[PDB]
Amino acid sequence: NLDTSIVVVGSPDDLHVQSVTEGLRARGHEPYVFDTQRFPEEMTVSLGEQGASIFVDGQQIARPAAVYLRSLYQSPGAYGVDADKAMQDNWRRTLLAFRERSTLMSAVLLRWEEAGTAVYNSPRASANITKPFQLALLRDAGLPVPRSLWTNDPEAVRRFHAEVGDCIYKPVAGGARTRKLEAKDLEADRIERLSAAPVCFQELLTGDDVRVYVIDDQVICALRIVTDEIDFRQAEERIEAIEISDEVKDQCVRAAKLVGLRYTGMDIKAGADGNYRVLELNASAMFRGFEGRANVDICGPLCDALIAQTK
Amino acid sequence: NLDTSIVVVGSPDDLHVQSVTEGLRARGHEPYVFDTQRFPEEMTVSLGEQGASIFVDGQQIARPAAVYLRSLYDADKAMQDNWRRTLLAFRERSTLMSAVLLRWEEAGTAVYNSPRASANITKPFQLALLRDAGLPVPRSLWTNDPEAVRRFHAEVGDCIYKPVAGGARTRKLEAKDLEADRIERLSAAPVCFQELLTGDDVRVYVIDDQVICALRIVEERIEAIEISDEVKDQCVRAAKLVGLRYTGMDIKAGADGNYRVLELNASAMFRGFEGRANVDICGPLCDALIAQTKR
Amino acid sequence: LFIEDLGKVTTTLAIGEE
Numbered sequence: 001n002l003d004t005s006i007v008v009v010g011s012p013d014d015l016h017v018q019s020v021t022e023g024l025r026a027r028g029h030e031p032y033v034f035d036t037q038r039f040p041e042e043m044t045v046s047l048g049e050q051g052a053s054i055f056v057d058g059q060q061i062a063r064p065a066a067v068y069l070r071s072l073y074q075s076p077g078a079y080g081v082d083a084d085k086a087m088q089d090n091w092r093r094t095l096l097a098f099r100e101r102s103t104l105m106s107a108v109l110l111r112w113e114e115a116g117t118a119v120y121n122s123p124r125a126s127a128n129i130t131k132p133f134q135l136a137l138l139r140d141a142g143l144p145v146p147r148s149l150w151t152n153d154p155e156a157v158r159r160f161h162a163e164v165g166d167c168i169y170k171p172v173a174g175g176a177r178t179r180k181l182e183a184k185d186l187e188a189d190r191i192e193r194l195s196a197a198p199v200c201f202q203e204l205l206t207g208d209d210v211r212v213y214v215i216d217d218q219v220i221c222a223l224r225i226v227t228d229e230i231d232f233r234q235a236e237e238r239i240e241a242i243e244i245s246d247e248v249k250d251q252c253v254r255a256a257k258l259v260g261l262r263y264t265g266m267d268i269k270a271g272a273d274g275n276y277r278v279l280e281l282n283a284s285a286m287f288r289g290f291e292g293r294a295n296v297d298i299c300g301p302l303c304d305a306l307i308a309q310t311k
Numbered sequence: 312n313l314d315t316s317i318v319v320v321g322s323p324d325d326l327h328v329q330s331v332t333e334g335l336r337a338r339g340h341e342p343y344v345f346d347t348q349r350f351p352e353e354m355t356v357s358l359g360e361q362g363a364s365i366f367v368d369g370q371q372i373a374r375p376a377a378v379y380l381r382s383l384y385d386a387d388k389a390m391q392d393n394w395r396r397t398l399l400a401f402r403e404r405s406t407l408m409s410a411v412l413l414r415w416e417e418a419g420t421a422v423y424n425s426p427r428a429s430a431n432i433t434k435p436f437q438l439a440l441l442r443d444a445g446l447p448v449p450r451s452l453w454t455n456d457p458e459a460v461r462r463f464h465a466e467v468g469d470c471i472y473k474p475v476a477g478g479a480r481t482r483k484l485e486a487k488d489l490e491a492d493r494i495e496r497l498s499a500a501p502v503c504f505q506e507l508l509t510g511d512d513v514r515v516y517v518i519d520d521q522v523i524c525a526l527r528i529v530e531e532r533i534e535a536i537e538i539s540d541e542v543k544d545q546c547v548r549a550a551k552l553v554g555l556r557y558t559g560m561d562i563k564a565g566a567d568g569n570y571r572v573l574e575l576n577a578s579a580m581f582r583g584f585e586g587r588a589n590v591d592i593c594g595p596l597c598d599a600l601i602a603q604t605k606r
Numbered sequence: 607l608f609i610e611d612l613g614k615v616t617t618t619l620a621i622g623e624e
């Protein structure tokens with residue numbers, strides 16, 4: 001007897017899953033929490049040849065009205081996954097198990113989207129999310145992005161640096177903090193380490209990192225993140241809701257539509273000239289710390305957008 | 312200086328890349344061989360923010376006319392030491408490569424089997440996509456629920472089990488397998504059950520909305536079997552649903568002489584098929600790759 | 607790796623919002 005009009009895909013220990021279950025319970029809708037992490041051992045999934053033939057723990061779930069996709073946990077290296085001991089035992093069968101799970105849950109989510117479920121960030125957007133492709137998709141569509149160079153060739157790095165000036169490097173797909181390109185990094189000894197993996201070099205923008213939240217083609221807020229460095233022993237972070245011009249808004253909405261996102265926390269940043277460049281759009285953006293430090297409500301609009309799909 | 316009008320993504324050590332290259336070479340079009348197995352340690356690619364700024368080994372390769380995608384992707388020393396890092400490193404490489412491909416596709420390149428198809432290709436969703444669009448598919452059940460498979464058998468009759476994905480011989484579900492002890496093995500080992508079809512395993516190749524051939528795989532001996540225009544229509548439809556440009560499909564016939572689509576493949580092999588039934592697969596493929604250079 | 611801190615678990619939430 002469970003209602004599956006709103007499904008929150010994710011583990012119930014994810015603070016953001018909890019936050020949405022609560023934003024939803026307090027508006028009336030109990031949600032169905034779909035934890036893939038317990039698929040083989042503690043969950044039942046059965047799929048029939050018909051896209052409507054979907055049975056989770058015995059109950060049929062043909063078409064939720066809306067899904068909030070926090071994470072499918074496809075990789076053992078994913079955020080909310082403790083797979084360390086299993087990977088230290090056999091990295092091969094664990095990878096196999098995660099791919100085995102992935103194809104089934106992906107099939108569930110794709111069947112749902114086919115049926116008309118409003119998936120708040122459908123996994124199909126993965127293709128447009130690839131950053132070296134995402135930034136070009138935005139650039140050639142008229143949004144400004146940093147002067148970039150994804151590469152494994154040190155000479156390309158040297159010439160891009162001589163073209164641009166101060167530069168940062170950061171991961172191609174993600175997983176580490178961006179850091180200033182220092183002169184030590186251009187010495188042969190370490191710049192030749194690009195043969196192990198490419199990295200992303202970009203023009204060092206000096207302005208303000210602004211996080212813009214977009215839900216269903218509307219900007220919820222725009223939070224300016226400032227690093228307070230008056231005291232070097234307690235460097236803190238001040239986050240402030242700010243007004244952005246309508247031009248900037250419409251550009252963020254366009255970008256969200258280009259990549260294929262419904263709920264997106266995108267990061268932009270201004271150059272020396274005080275004008276924003278798009279840095280990245282996130283497919284399962286977090287919001288809790290921003291809400292807290294900036295005194296805004298992001299979870300509320302998301303829950304309302306989810307509930308508006310049942311109507 | 313190279314042509315880069317037609318790009319073959321794959322290793323030179325691969326027989327298919329070889330056939331396709333040799334066949335292309337013969338036809339007059341020398342291709343480029345993006346041997347992405349060399350990517351980090353040997354070759355170099357550089358991407359700029361402008362989709363055209365794609366530089367492989369120093370030579371700009373924006374917008375090829377057509378791409379044949381075969382393959383894109385030793386680690387035990389590294390994963391047993393740091394698996395999180397090694398997985399992340401491989402993700403960095405694959406991200407750069409997948410991008411090159413996606414950039415080409417956005418710019419106009421007819422990629423023969425674009426990676427975007429992977430979404431539509433996930434089988435427990437692929438067969439639902441085929442069915443829900445009116446195509447004949449076998450009754451199927453993906454499950455880890457033993458009660459579900461007991462009723463699926465009871466409803467469809469004798470049936471088979473094929474792996475959830477990948478490679479293992481299709482086997483017949485026998486009554487001995489339905490006992491508590493034997494059936495409970497799927498409590499954590501999901502496989503795909505399907506109504507047992509009795510007709511011939513027939514493989515059909517589709518390129519640009521046209522069937523090329525069909526061979527009854529009956530030492531195994533496979534031979535060409537012409538089929539109705541109806542099933543051909545159904546085949547090209549299925550390939551246009553999944554979003555493939557060159558596909559090698561498996562279809563099987565029921566007892567009533569009607570065919571059911573079993574599976575389309577992201578990049579099907581053809582060397583061990585055109586050398587056992589005497590038809591030409593690589594030829595029409597190269598013809599299509601060249602034909603795009605006029606669009 | 608050039609960015610030596612990729613696989614450092616210091617999971618690090620640098621990949622959280624992905």
Ligand SMILES: Nc1ncnc2c1ncn2[C@@H]1O[C@H](COP(=O)(O)OP(=O)(O)O)[C@@H](O)[C@H]1O
Pocket residue numbers: 146168170173174175176178202203204205206209267269279280620
């Ligand atoms: N070109 C750039 N110039 C200056 N700062 C940058 C640049 N790119 C990224 N950053 C800074 O690094 C942080 C992370 O960048 P981002 O592109 O969001 O990477 P990720 O999504 O992997 O964390 C951002 O908050 C931004 O402040």
Ligand SMILES: [Mg+2]
Pocket residue numbers: 267280
């Ligand atoms: Mg970011």
Ligand SMILES: [Mg+2]
Pocket residue numbers: 174280282623624
């Ligand atoms: Mg990110």
